[PDB]
Amino acid sequence: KHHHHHHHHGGLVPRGSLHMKVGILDSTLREGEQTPGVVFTTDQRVEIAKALSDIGVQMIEAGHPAVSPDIYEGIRRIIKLKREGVIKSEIVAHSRAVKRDIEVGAEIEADRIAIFYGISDTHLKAKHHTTRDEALRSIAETVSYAKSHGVKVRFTAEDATRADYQYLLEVIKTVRDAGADRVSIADTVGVLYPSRTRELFKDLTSRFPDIEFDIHAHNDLGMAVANVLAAAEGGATIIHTTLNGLGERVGIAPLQVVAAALKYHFGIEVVDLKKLSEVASLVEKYSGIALPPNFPITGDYAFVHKAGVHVAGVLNDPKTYEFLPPETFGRSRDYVIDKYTGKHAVKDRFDRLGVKLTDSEIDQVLAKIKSNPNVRFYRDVDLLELAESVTGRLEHHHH
Amino acid sequence: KHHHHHHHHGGLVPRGSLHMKVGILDSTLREGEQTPGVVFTTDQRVEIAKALSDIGVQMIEAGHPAVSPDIYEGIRRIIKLKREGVIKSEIVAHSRAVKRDIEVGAEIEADRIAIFYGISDTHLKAKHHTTRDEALRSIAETVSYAKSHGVKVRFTAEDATRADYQYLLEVIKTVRDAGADRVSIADTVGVLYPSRTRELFKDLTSRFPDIEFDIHAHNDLGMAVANVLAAAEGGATIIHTTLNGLGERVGIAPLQVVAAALKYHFGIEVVDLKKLSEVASLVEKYSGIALPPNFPITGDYAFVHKAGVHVAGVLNDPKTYEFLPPETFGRSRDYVIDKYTGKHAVKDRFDRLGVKLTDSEIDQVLAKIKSNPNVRFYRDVDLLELAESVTGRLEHHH
Numbered sequence: 079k080h081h082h083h084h085h086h087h088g089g090l091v092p093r094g095s096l097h098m099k100v101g102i103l104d105s106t107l108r109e110g111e112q113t114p115g116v117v118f119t120t121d122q123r124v125e126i127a128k129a130l131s132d133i134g135v136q137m138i139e140a141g142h143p144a145v146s147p148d149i150y151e152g153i154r155r156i157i158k159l160k161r162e163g164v165i166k167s168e169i170v171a172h173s174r175a176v177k178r179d180i181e182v183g184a185e186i187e188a189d190r191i192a193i194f195y196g197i198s199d200t201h202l203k204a205k206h207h208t209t210r211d212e213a214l215r216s217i218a219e220t221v222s223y224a225k226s227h228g229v230k231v232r233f234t235a236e237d238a239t240r241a242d243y244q245y246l247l248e249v250i251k252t253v254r255d256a257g258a259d260r261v262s263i264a265d266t267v268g269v270l271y272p273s274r275t276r277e278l279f280k281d282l283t284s285r286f287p288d289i290e291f292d293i294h295a296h297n298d299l300g301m302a303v304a305n306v307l308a309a310a311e312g313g314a315t316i317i318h319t320t321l322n323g324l325g326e327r328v329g330i331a332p333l334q335v336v337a338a339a340l341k342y343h344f345g346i347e348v349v350d351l352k353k354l355s356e357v358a359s360l361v362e363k364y365s366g367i368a369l370p371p372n373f374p375i376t377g378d379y380a381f382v383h384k385a386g387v388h389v390a391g392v393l394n395d396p397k398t399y400e401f402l403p404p405e406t407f408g409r410s411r412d413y414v415i416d417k418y419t420g421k422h423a424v425k426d427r428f429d430r431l432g433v434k435l436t437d438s439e440i441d442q443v444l445a446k447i448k449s450n451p452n453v454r455f456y457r458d459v460d461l462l463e464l465a466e467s468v469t470g471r472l473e474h475h476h477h
Numbered sequence: 478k479h480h481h482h483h484h485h486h487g488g489l490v491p492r493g494s495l496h497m498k499v500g501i502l503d504s505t506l507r508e509g510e511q512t513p514g515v516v517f518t519t520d521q522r523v524e525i526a527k528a529l530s531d532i533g534v535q536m537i538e539a540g541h542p543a544v545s546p547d548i549y550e551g552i553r554r555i556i557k558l559k560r561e562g563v564i565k566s567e568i569v570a571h572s573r574a575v576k577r578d579i580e581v582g583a584e585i586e587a588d589r590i591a592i593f594y595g596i597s598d599t600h601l602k603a604k605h606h607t608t609r610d611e612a613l614r615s616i617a618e619t620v621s622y623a624k625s626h627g628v629k630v631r632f633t634a635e636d637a638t639r640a641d642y643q644y645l646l647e648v649i650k651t652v653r654d655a656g657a658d659r660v661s662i663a664d665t666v667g668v669l670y671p672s673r674t675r676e677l678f679k680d681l682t683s684r685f686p687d688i689e690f691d692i693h694a695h696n697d698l699g700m701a702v703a704n705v706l707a708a709a710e711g712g713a714t715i716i717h718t719t720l721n722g723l724g725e726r727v728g729i730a731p732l733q734v735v736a737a738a739l740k741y742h743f744g745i746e747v748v749d750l751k752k753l754s755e756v757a758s759l760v761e762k763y764s765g766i767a768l769p770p771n772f773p774i775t776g777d778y779a780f781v782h783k784a785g786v787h788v789a790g791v792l793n794d795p796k797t798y799e800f801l802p803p804e805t806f807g808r809s810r811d812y813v814i815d816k817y818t819g820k821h822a823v824k825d826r827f828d829r830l831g832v833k834l835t836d837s838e839i840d841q842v843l844a845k846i847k848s849n850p851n852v853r854f855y856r857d858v859d860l861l862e863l864a865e866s867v868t869g870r871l872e873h874h875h
């Protein structure tokens with residue numbers, strides 16, 4: 079059900095509402111550990127990998143084993159758990175285009191080796207100190223070398239979204255010929271525009287039908303989610319994510335939001351939607367970066383209503399202010415009470431507390447609530463005290 | 478292999494040059510006989526149906542049996558040939574939403590009955606004198622009745638492209654529930670804009686995955702070909718054509734152009750491309766309507782070059798001025814000579830004629846050619862006379 083292969087889809091569902099394929103690669107353990115201030119222990123890494131396997135992630139990028147001894151050891155443990163059937167996702171190891179990295183990737187027995195290289199002109203010049211042609215040779219050699227160990231090879235075209243497009247096409251032919259079966263198109267600095275992303279992937283998939291494409295999208299301009307969905311429309315079959323929007327700088331497409339947007343817009347369930355909160359909370363614990371309360375899907379406030387008009391509507395039909403039911407994600411709605419509330423919301427909360435107030439008493443409590451501008455919420459004890467102030471009586475709920 | 482089922486495709490081929498499907502329904506025998514001044518005899522109908530089958534058309538719309546006794550007889554003969562396996566295409570009979578048309582369509586044993594009804598506001602009011610709700614009931618009953626005879630049913634939404642879209646969706650739900658497996662979307666007056674056609678079919682195919690859609694596109698604004706390719710982009714699996722642009726008023730999408738355009742842009746071959754000229758000619762003969770010389774693909778001049786600069790280029794590499802090789806369609810290139818010519822062209826024609834002239838003599842001939850403003854063609858006899866007039870030698874087998 080929450081399996082570890084591709085999910086069939088048909089693109090966007092109809093307005094006012096299966097030949098294509100898509101799945102998740104989660105990079106919490108690679109991209110995600112490149113977040114300033116974030117490091118994971120080996121045990122933490124392993125615990126996260128198991129959680130990602132359990133919710134049905136297709137691929138886990140477990141790290142770049144040359145980076146440090148602990149990353150090597152965490153990847154090894156994960157591959158061992160995979161070999162034992164405890165973990166079921168495909169395990170990907172990252173690699174520079176250097177023989178050493180590749181040999182290490184091969185020796186730990188990863189399912190896939192992802193070789194990256196920067197193929198924009200700034201990267202070729204400033205980062206690699208190389209020419210277009212020399213880069214083509216290095217990439218061909220390293221991809222072939224990795225292939226010859228009998229492991230599947232992805233090539234990541236770093237800064238592809240600012241690269242010369244003709245060169246990008248040449249890069250892809252090169253790595254295809256050298257044995258790569260997947261190419262990741264990396265929007266390294268988050269500058270893709272969604273409608274253009276769709277076009278890009280439509281073009282690439284039409285040109286290279288023997289290759290499957292990944293989208294790796296950074297959120298520098300706040301459009302990572304929209305870019306990954308657009309890529310999927312265009313035929314990308316793997317979307318890279320991290321839990322909680324972890325990664326370099328502002329991070330990449332966040333798993334919980336991507337998964338929800340794919341459910342709503344494409345009608346598919348690429349991971350266990352009901353377990354997003356639990357996995358997000360786990361990563362939050364080990365990463366030490368708190369999710370803001372406004373984070374989509376898993377955020378504290380995602381299904382919390384405030385304005386009186388909204389709460390009144392929700393009490394009649396939650397769909398009025400809820401894009402999908404909270405239960406879709408294993409959550410429940412709530413509402414808060416402050417000076418923005420109204421009579422229906424206040425009545426409903428008193429009803430929950432078992433306190434019967436008259437219509438005019440409700441008016442008086444509402445007026446008292448609205449008389450103070452700088453109170454952030456009214457807790458039940460506050461509301462009980464307000465009622466007492468109106469009834470003169472000592473005022474049953476189990477929470 | 479020019480078989481008689483759907484052809485697989487993947488939409489447009491990449492810039493700088495399989496989950497979808499498409500095939501041809503040719504309506505030369507139905508829509509095409511609705512061209513002013515065109516009628517076919519029963520014999521000619523049968524012979525056109527055979528040629529349509531031979532080139533690999535998926536569906537032949539062989540006529541509307543209720544219209545006349547000779548149409549009824551032609552269809553009956555076509556169906557007999559289908560039974561005998563001479564004709565292999567699916568045979569479609571047209572029908573109004575009237576019990577008699579349907580019984581008759583059932584009675585001749587057509588493979589499919591196509592019931593049409595006008596679902597735009599002007600059609601409902603001025604032509605059917607009915608309401609949206611009544612139309613729905615009539616359409617439901619008639620489709621159901623046709624389906625109860627155990628025959629496949631297409632519903633044609635006439636004037637769909639100017640109908641209320643919400644109503645069109647209700648129409649399609651209605652006929653689908655009544656048992657229609659195909660719906661034809663008719664751009665009856667040719668007002669579809671191509672990019673909007675793609676969107677229309679994309680939307681309809683996503684909403685009704687258990688129906689296949691046809692496009693029937695008229696050429697009133699010259700965009701029938703662009704419209705049918707756009708419909709195919711969007712998921713239409715049947716494109717309606719006629720040979721030679723036959724049909725009411727200005728006709729519908731012409732088979733030879735649709736077939737070429739699909740080959741170039743989608744990379745597929747939905748009929749035998751090398752037989753297009755032959756079938757166009759046959760239909761030209763029986764319709765009595767000549768194709769203009771500029772008609773694409775099969776026209777006299779489709780692969781005939783004129784300007785000196787073009788002919789010089791083509792003589793070095795024909796691809797310079799040919800979208801695809803003429804042999805694609807079993808044809809050959811040519812060029813003409815008039816005041817627009819140049820030295821490479823004139824030299825080449827003399828070579829064909831076996832006449833050896835010096836460059837100086839070519840220049841003189843060329844100057845004489847360019848001195849006659851109103852000579853339409855220098856035919857070979859004329860060229861031989863020009864060469865004789867320059868060389869003083871005998872030069873002049875056609």
Ligand SMILES: CC(C)(COP(=O)(O)OP(=O)(O)OC[C@H]1O[C@@H](n2cnc3c(N)ncnc32)[C@H](O)[C@@H]1OP(=O)(O)O)[C@@H](O)C(=O)NCCC(=O)NCCS
Nearest residue numbers: 142144145146173174175176193194195196205206207236
């Ligand atoms: C990999 C790592 C151990 C290398 O450390 P290092 O050898 O001290 O090198 P530096 O970090 O100073 O990085 C630059 C070197 O890598 C090279 N390089 C960068 N990307 C490369 C690639 N895709 N293929 C080959 N070489 C690459 C640079 O040209 C440079 O080489 P140089 O030492 O000859 O100048 C270290 O950078 C690291 O731990 N990085 C974290 C992982 C990471 O950077 N991931 C990048 C994802 S794009």
Ligand SMILES: CC(C)(COP(=O)(O)OP(=O)(O)OC[C@H]1O[C@@H](n2cnc3c(N)ncnc32)[C@H](O)[C@@H]1OP(=O)(O)O)[C@@H](O)C(=O)NCCC(=O)NCCS
Nearest residue numbers: 541543544545572573574575592593594595604605606635
């Ligand atoms: C079909 C046929 C013989 C009808 O002849 P007719 O009975 O003398 O009627 P007319 O052609 O004058 O008028 C059409 C009649 O059919 C009705 N009609 C039109 N389209 C219809 C449809 N899709 N379903 C049912 N009835 C329809 C009209 O309301 C009108 O009815 P009326 O007689 O009550 O006014 C005759 O119109 C004919 O041969 N037409 C050629 C085929 C044709 O018209 N094809 C159109 C494809 S869109």
Ligand SMILES: O=C(O)CCC(=O)C(=O)O
Nearest residue numbers: 234236237262264266294
């Ligand atoms: O391997 C990938 O797809 C992404 C590499 C990366 O982090 C980037 O270039 O942004």
Ligand SMILES: O=C(O)CCC(=O)C(=O)O
Nearest residue numbers: 633635636661663665693
């Ligand atoms: O049957 C069809 O598909 C087309 C009907 C027709 O004649 C039209 O509306 O143009």
Ligand SMILES: [Zn+2]
Nearest residue numbers: 109266294326
């Ligand atoms: Zn990245």
Ligand SMILES: [Zn+2]
Nearest residue numbers: 508665693729
């Ligand atoms: Zn028509």
